[PDB]
């Protein structure tokens, strides 16, 4: 898995960044699919969410290692994705965010 993070601060970053397009609640989809239970989940499977062609076809499984790269440069990991976030350059913010994602299960 990815570098060690802080879920408390991760919640803070989730709710100041991710929350603009996603939710941390199960099954509740907005502009983006719910991130509840995302860790370990296969891409494009959140019920009722309208995924892009790229995401569905990806064949990605959201492990910590992958989420770490993706959050940094989404287009590099899912070329053609419709997730508009330029990316998170701070590696510690990415580890904290993932740390928080991990509790959502
Ligand atoms: C916050 C820093 C943040 C995270 C974390 C995040 C994650 C994420 C994942 C893991 C996916 C794929 C999940 C799956 O396959 O089910 C995904 C997808 C979308 N996102 Fe995202 N995302 C974060 C931030 C943001 C922000 C700020 C926006 C909106 C400006 C956004 C949007 C989207 C969209 C749309 C998708 C679906 C992509 C597609 O089908 O191509 N995310 N995000």
From Swiss-Prot:
Keywords per UniProt: Electron transport, Heme, Iron, Metal-binding, Photosynthesis, Transport
GO biological process terms, semicolon-separated: photosynthesis
Disulfide linkage: none
PTM per Swiss-Prot/TrEMBL: Binds 1 heme c group covalently per subunit.
Source taxon at top rank: Bacteria
InterPro entries: Cyt_c-like_dom, Cyt_c-like_dom_sf, Cyt_c_1A/1B
Signal peptide residues on this chain, from the entry's feature table: none
Residues annotated to bind heme c: 18, 21-22, 83
A Pfam family matched in the record: Cytochrom_C
GO MF term list: electron transfer activity; heme binding; metal ion binding
Similarity annotation: Belongs to the cytochrome c family.
Protein name stated in the entry: Cytochrome c2
């Amino acid at each position: 898995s990815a570098p060690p993070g802080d879920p408390v601060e991760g919640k803070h970053l989730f709710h100041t960044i991710c929350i603009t397009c996603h939710t941390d609640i199960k099954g509740a989809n907005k502009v983006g699919p719910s991130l509840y239970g995302v860790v370990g989940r296969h891409s494009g499977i959140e019920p009722g969410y309208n995924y892009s062609e790229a995401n569905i076809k990806s064949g990605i499984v959201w492990t910590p290692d992958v989420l770490f790269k993706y959050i940094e440069h989404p287009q590099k990991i899912v070329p053609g994705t419709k997730m508009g976030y330029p990316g998170q350059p701070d590696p510690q913010k990415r580890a904290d965010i993932i740390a928080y994602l991990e509790t959502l299960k």
